[PDB]
Structures are given as C-alpha cells and as structure tokens.
Write a protein that binds this ligand. Structure first.
Ligand code: HEM
Ligand code: HEM
Ligand SMILES: CNCc1cccc(OCc2ccc3ccc(N)nc3c2)c1
Ligand SMILES: CNCc1cccc(OCc2ccc3ccc(N)nc3c2)c1
Ligand SMILES: C[C@H](O)[C@H](O)[C@H]1CNc2nc(N)[nH]c(=O)c2N1
Ligand SMILES: C[C@H](O)[C@H](O)[C@H]1CNc2nc(N)[nH]c(=O)c2N1
Ligand SMILES: [Zn+2]
Lengths: 407, 411
C-alpha cells in the first residue's frame, strides 16, 4: 500500500503515498496493463467540491478553520440551490496550477507554480474570447521570453452552453490535400484546415499558413478570427554548420498553446481553457518535422547530406534526425526564443520528482510520455521507475467539437 | 470482452481476445499503473490445474483436444502428481513449452523468430562438469561461425527447492568489471559484483578491459564451480567505424552471442531455474546500452572529443551525435565480420508484422511498450506509434533472485 520507485542509474529509492489519494481510474486492471493506450448532478457535486476545498484549505494551513467550515457551508448552500457553484479567484488559481502539477504526462512540471492565470469567466461572445486569446498570446510570447499562462472561460452549465476553442492549439500551420495525392502544409491539420475553408477561410495554400481561430461561445456556432501576424512569433530554421539548411525553407512558431483540453476543478468543468508554456526541441524536430504522418522531411534532409540511404543499417535516419534537432535548438537560441533541449528538461524533471516525493509524498508520472522521442536511454528519465495515477484537479481530453456540436 | 489497439501512424485497429486467457497478475490496479516498474517449493495442491491447463493448451495446438491421447496423458500426469508430488514433461511438451514461453515474452522485440528455437534437453544432467559440457555445446551450436542460431538448453526442474540447478552468470558470455581503489572501474561496471564472487571462488583475473568471465555453475543445489569457456568458442568482434579511422584505436570489441542465463522457465507448473537461451543482438543493446549507458562502459565523451564536438552545452546534442556514430560502428563491425546482427529499424518493423500476424492467428500479442521501443530514435520506429496491451500468459520466462543471495553454502 506504500509503493517504492527505484532509479536504476543511481539506485535512489523514493516511497510513494500520494497515490492513495487518487480517485479516478487508470484503465489498467491486475490482469492487463494499458499504459501505452493513448486515450482510455447535485449529489455528485458536493463530495467533489468538498474534496477540493479540503485540499485547498489544507494547503494554506487552515484545515479545520472557521473559514474552511464556512466556505464548505456556503458552497453546499449554493449547490442545493443552484445545482452548481462558483470558485473564488484564489481557488481558481490554485486549481489551475494543481491541474498542471498533476499532469502525469508533462515533463515540464518543475515550473508548475509559476503559471499566470487569466480569469475570463465574464466572457459572453466569440469576439470576447478572441480578445482574451490575443491578450494571452501577447503576454505568453513576451517578445520571445516566454511565460506560462492559462485563460479560463466560463464553466460548463448543462452541456448546451459550452465554450470551446475548436483549434487543437492556438497556433498551427494549415494542411491541404492535393489532386497530386500527397499533402501540402501540416498533415495533422488537414481536416481542420478544411473545416476552416468549409467555413469561409481563404487559404494562401502555402506550406506554412498560420490557421485562423475558430471560436465557440455559449454553445453558438463558431466564428473565424485571424491572429494578428505581429503576435505570432516564428523562428526560421537554419543549421550552424550546413549552409544549405536555410534553403530547405522551414520555420516554426515559438508558442505551443494547447486549446482543446478540459480543466476539472472541484467537480466543475472548464471546456475552454487554452494554456501555453514553451517548447522542448524534440516536439518540433522529432515529432513535427520527422513523423511519417506529419512534415516527414527525413529523406529530403538525408539526400542533401548525401548519406547512404541504401540500407537502414547505415542509420541515416538517426543521423539526419540529430542534425535537425541541433538546428531547431540553434535557431531558437540564436533568436532569443525560449526553448529547452530534451537533456535539460528531463534532468529538471528528475529534480522535480525528487522535490515532489519530498514535499508531497509522490509525483504521478507517465513513463511512456515522459521519455523523449529520441535518445531515450541517454536521458535520466529512462532509468527512472514511475507510478501513474490520476489526481484532481486535472486536465482531461474531450471529444472534437465538430463531432458533437448541435449545429 | 474485446479490446482494441490502434496504430496512430496507420490507423490500423486490432482486436484482442487472447487477454482473456491470462491468469497471472500484472502489478497494475484500477487506480495505479506500474507499467514502468522493472521487477513487479510448490504443492501438489495447486500443481494439478496448472498441469491440466498446459496440457489442454498443448493438445489444442496439435489438434488432438479431447482425444484419447489427451485424456490418458491427463490421467498419467494426475497419478504421477499424487504419487511423486510432481511430474515429468514429454520431449514434445518441453519443446512446445520453451517456444511458447518465448512467444509469450511481452518484453521481447525479436519474437517473429519464436517458432525457430533449437531446444536442448539437459534434464539428465547431474553435475556442474556436465552443465559445462552442455553449455559449451550450446555456445558452439548457437554461434555457428557467425551465422547465429537461436537456442535454449534446459536443465532439471526444481523439486523441493533445495536441489536447484542454477547458472550464476547473468549471461553465458560477459566481460569482467573491476572496482579500483581510486573509485574508477576497469571493464564492465555491470559485472563488478559477479566478478568479485568469481575471484573469491578462485578465479585468477587477468584484470584487463575485456576479460570474458568464467562460468559459475550450480548442479543439484551443490556449491557452484568455476569453468573457463574455451576461447575458440567465444566469437568476438573488433569495433571500427566506416569513416572514422581513429575509432579502432578506442580499443573496443564485443562478443557475438547474447545468451541470457539467469531467468526461470515456467511450464505447466514446473520450474526450470537453469535454462540459458541465446539469439542474436539488436545493435542498440551494445551501442546504446552497453557502451553509452552512464552505468556501463560510458564512452560517449571520449568519442565526442575525438569527433571535436561542442561539448560545452547539452543543447549542441553532442551526446546524441556520438551515440549515433557508436551505433553505426557497432552495426558496421558485425556486418563486416559476417556476425548476425539486426538494426533497430529492421527489428521493430519485423515486430509490427509479427504482432499483426499474432492478432489474426492467435487473438492477440502481449507486448510491453516500455521495453519494445528501442533506447534511441524511438519515434522514427513504427513501434512507438503502436498501442500495445501487456498481460501475462504461461508458459513464461520469469525473473528469479540472484543465487548468491539465497544459496545455502556447503563447503
Ligand atoms: C513551460 C514549459 C513546458 C514544457 C517544456 C512542457 C513539456 C511537455 C511535453 C514535451 C509534453 C508531451 C507533449 C507531446 O508529446 O505532445 C507535455 C504534455 C502536457 N503538458 Fe506540459 N510543458 C510545459 C508547460 C505546460 C503547461 C503551462 C501546462 C498547463 C498549464 C502543461 C500541461 C500539459 C498537459 C496536460 C500534457 C499532457 C496532455 C495529454 O494528456 O496529452 N504543460 N508537456
Ligand atoms: C533471435 C533474436 C532475438 C532478438 C533480436 C531479441 C531482442 C530482444 C531485446 C532487444 C530485448 C530487450 C533486452 C534488454 O533491453 O535488456 C529482449 C528481451 C527478452 N527476450 Fe528476446 N531477442 C531474441 C531472442 C530471444 C530468445 C531466443 C528468447 C528465449 C528463448 C528471448 C526471450 C526474451 C525475454 C524473456 C526478454 C525479456 C527479458 C526481461 O524481461 O528482462 N529472446 N529481446
Ligand atoms: C497529439 N498528441 C495528443 C494530444 C492531444 C491533445 C493535447 C496534447 O497535448 C500535448 C501538449 C500539451 C501541453 C504542452 C505544453 C508545453 C509543450 N511544450 N508541449 C505541450 C504539448 C496532446
Ligand atoms: C538488464 N535488464 C534486466 C534483465 C535481467 C535478466 C535478463 C535480461 O534479459 C535481457 C535480454 C533477454 C533476452 C535477449 C535475447 C536476445 C537479445 N538480443 N537480447 C536479450 C536481452 C534483462
Ligand atoms: C525504469 C524502466 O522501467 C527501465 O529503465 C527500463 C526502461 N525500458 C527498458 N527497455 C529495454 N529494452 N531494456 C531495459 O533495460 C529497459 N529498462
Ligand atoms: C502508441 C503510443 O501510446 C503513442 O505513440 C504515444 C507514445 N508516447 C508519446 N509520448 C509523447 N511525449 N507524446 C506522444 O504523442 C506520444 N505518443
Ligand atoms: Zn498499467
């Protein structure tokens, strides 16, 4: 019931008790592990509220205080009356930071307590949402000195007045299918690139077109908005050794801002809560550039390096992958845009893990996601045993809006 | 109940029914996943149904389920159990068992090869000298002058737990590791503790960088004995790089035959505590893990210096760069010497085909993503994007504690 995790490179052993406070389900059973599966009313509400307020008031050293008891009293009143309740700003901020702190798949959590929270619960329209989103982008970007931020729109009421950002990220490049057969731009965004066009967007049908925002307020039909180009910081990609690299004509944006997740706090659901930090190099160079179902330019780059692409055993893909990732990092660093390499980030995470075991009794961590997509075993997280479990507040997945929206 | 797994790169969806045949526990619960945990004297009482379940499996595979041969065998085993408290497997059953233990090894990416396994029955063995002979023959057969052949040698099963056969070595062929008084390590750091035991047992160490360790062999629960593998049986490969001439001067080499010898083979409730098996290497095992793990030979820096890389900031990815070239050199050396090896792209590509075939013909393929994904260049191999289900089927290979921690010493 008290679980131990071992690091095999250092022999360090941590003891986890935090998992006992876990409440949601993993998808695993004692007969089967699902660790590599990507996607596994009033009476329901008050225990959920109670649980949250319990941990909040414990965190400020007023567990069992009159304020705690009164707040519990007040929230219970509000629930029986209104069939929901509203979070105080302090509780909202706490809940957002803790959803990040609890995100078992995030390697960047050493930063969790420095999150800038923007309360947008007074928002009523898509133009309103647009304004808040623009403010978020400008603040987070900070001319290249990136700052973590989340903007929180009004909570779900009854599933009919949902606020939703339809983009998966605030900033992404368009993808177009050809008659020629292949794909121009980003293949992951083909379906969304088409819905925007199916909606009125006029595409420059280029290789790297910044997608428009598609914003849904209060359950209404979503509207297109173009993000002011001066708010979208981009980094041209060059290599510090290969002069022909620049000629490839690649660039990427500095701000990773995830916008399709659901934030759960005290039973309350925030369906629109775009958040942003800064990139780890491999998200762009390994996943975005080199994935087969994405920009997939490994071959192109290998050619210009004139590697023997004859047999897989020359490891030409491995060689190209590395140079690319060197370029991504070189480019952002040169341009004073915040980026972290996978070595630094995983080293930071090990330190964060040890902090959390110390000050909290554990740290839920999903190895399958924490270990980077290249050079896995030369990073310290590879040799680290991790326990995965779900804590709340939390970020959850939710269905794509176009599959659900009562149109 | 039916379970779906998706390949996110191809959108191929597969359906698993085989997991229903699973009995053994995973470690996971509904509230925790222990997916990344490395490591998560039997009575006639529980032996009966274990035997029966194995025999049901075996007779189904040969399409004789419920036959008179099936039923008689069941009666024969049942009688042997209540009489002698254990039982003996037929040769056919033993071969089926060993092959299926491999087929079921969810952490093994080489399983496309599972049906081609040479099974050596060493159950008539009684002494350590006899164990040495069987192991020598295994190594000679498996090596085959570089044209590697998968093999397993199986020693007598456990009885009362007091007469165990054990190979004390973790692998049949490994290099010694020596801790120096100045805190540094000569040879393979992973083998320091085992090297000490050998030396204590009387092994005269040459105390070099690549000394092949002696075999420490325990028959019938007796104290283990030292044997040196004849050097002509130990195929080794000098590591060079195809473009870098300075690489040979690093002085590296590795042995050709990976042969794991510390696992336990469970078949029909019987436990085979000594069952060394061998295949051939995936290049990254040597190049990534053996040479580049910080806890092993750890030659990354020396290689990076000789490449004249920017070693000042990790963001130069000097470590990643050196890692690739070391792995290129490993593959190049083995191919040049015509010693069987597989790169991680070929091996993972083959595993995917195997897994798809298994889902079709068998209803599933237990697979441990954490171990199947290779230790470098993970996302550019097809297994990275493959969802996998991990569960435990018998027959199986299991971990067991190191013998030096459990052995009762005789003298
Ligand atoms: C500040 C620098 C940050 C870094 C370097 C970072 C790093 C990462 C990386 C590499 C992943 C895996 C992404 C993928 O492979 O698709 C991830 C996932 C995730 N991140 Fe972080 N992150 C940062 C900030 C944040 C912030 C500010 C939040 C929320 C407030 C957050 C919440 C999450 C969540 C919920 C996931 C997993 C989503 C899922 O379940 O699929 N991260 N992070
Ligand atoms: C024929 C070529 C083979 C290849 C290329 C191969 C490849 C691999 C690799 C790369 C691993 C991971 C090892 C590690 O990272 O420590 C592994 C694990 C494993 N292999 Fe295979 N293997 C082969 C043959 C065999 C054979 C013949 C057997 C048994 C008869 C076997 C049984 C296992 C088992 C039980 C594991 C898991 C060990 C553990 O859980 O720690 N393999 N294999
Ligand atoms: C495509 N992978 C599935 C999927 C679906 C929805 C969200 C998501 O999040 C990835 C994610 C989330 C937060 C991040 C924060 C910072 C960062 N550099 N990357 C981050 C990446 C991942
Ligand atoms: C060091 N990791 C823990 C541990 C403990 C005991 C055995 C073992 O086996 C790894 C293993 C097992 C079988 C293999 C077969 C072929 C091969 N190329 N590598 C193989 C590697 C691994
Ligand atoms: C903590 C973690 O389970 C451990 O380091 C594992 C990770 N994946 C692995 N994968 C393989 N193939 N071999 C290993 O030894 C390991 N080690
Ligand atoms: C099949 C597998 O679950 C899928 O490819 C996962 C694996 N690990 C990952 N790890 C990270 N960080 N991000 C991902 O998108 C994925 N994808
Ligand atoms: Zn699990």
């Amino acid at each position: 019931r008290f679980l131990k995790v071992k690091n095999w490179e250092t022999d360090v052993v941590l003891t986890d008790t935090l998992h006992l406070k876990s409440t949601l389900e993993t998808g695993c059973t004692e007969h089967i592990c699902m660790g590599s599966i990507m996607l596994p009313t009033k009476d329901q509400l008050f225990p959920l509220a109670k649980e949250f307020l319990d941990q909040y008031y414990s965190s400020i050293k007023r567990f069992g205080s009159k304020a705690h008891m009164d707040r519990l009293e007040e929230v219970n009143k509000e629930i029986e009356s209104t069939s929901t309740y509203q979070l105080k700003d302090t509780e909202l901020i706490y809940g957002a930071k803790h959803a990040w702190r609890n995100a078992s798949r995030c390697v960047g959590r050493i930063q969790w307590s420095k999150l800038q929270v923007f309360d947008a619960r007074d928002c009523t329209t898509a133009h309103g949402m647009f304004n808040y989103i623009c403010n978020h982008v400008k603040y987070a970007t900070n001319k290249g000195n990136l700052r973590s931020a989340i903007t929180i729109f009004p909570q779900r009421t009854d599933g009919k007045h949902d606020f939703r950002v339809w983009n998966s990220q605030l900033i992404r490049y368009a993808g177009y299918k050809q008659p020629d057969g292949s794909t121009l731009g980003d293949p992951a965004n083909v379906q969304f690139t088409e819905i925007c066009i199916q909606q009125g967007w006029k595409a420059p049908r280029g290789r790297f077109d910044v997608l428009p925002l598609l914003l849904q307020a209060n359950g209404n039909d979503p509207e297109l908005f173009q993000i002011p180009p001066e708010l979208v910081l981009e980094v041209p990609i060059r290599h510090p050794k290969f002069d022909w690299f620049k000629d490839l004509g690649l660039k990427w944006y500095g701000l990773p801002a995830v916008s399709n997740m659901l934030l759960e706090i005290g039973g309350l659901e925030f369906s629109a809560c775009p958040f942003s930090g800064w990139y780890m190099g491999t998200e762009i160079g390994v996943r975005d550039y080199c994935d087969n179902s994405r920009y997939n330019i490994l071959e192109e780059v290998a050619k210009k390096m004139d590697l023997d692409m004859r047999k897989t055993s020359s490891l030409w893909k491995d060689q190209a992958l590395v140079e690319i990732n060197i370029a991504v990092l070189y480019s952002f660093q040169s341009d004073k845009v915040t980026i972290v390499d996978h070595h630094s980030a995983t080293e930071s995470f090990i330190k964060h893990m040890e902090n959390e075991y110390r000050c909290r009794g554990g740290c839920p961590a999903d190895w399958v996601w924490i270990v980077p997509p290249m050079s896995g075993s030369i990073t310290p997280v590879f040799h680290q045993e991790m326990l995965n479990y779900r804590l709340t507040p939390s970020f959850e997945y939710q269905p794509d809006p176009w599959n659900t929206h009562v149109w």
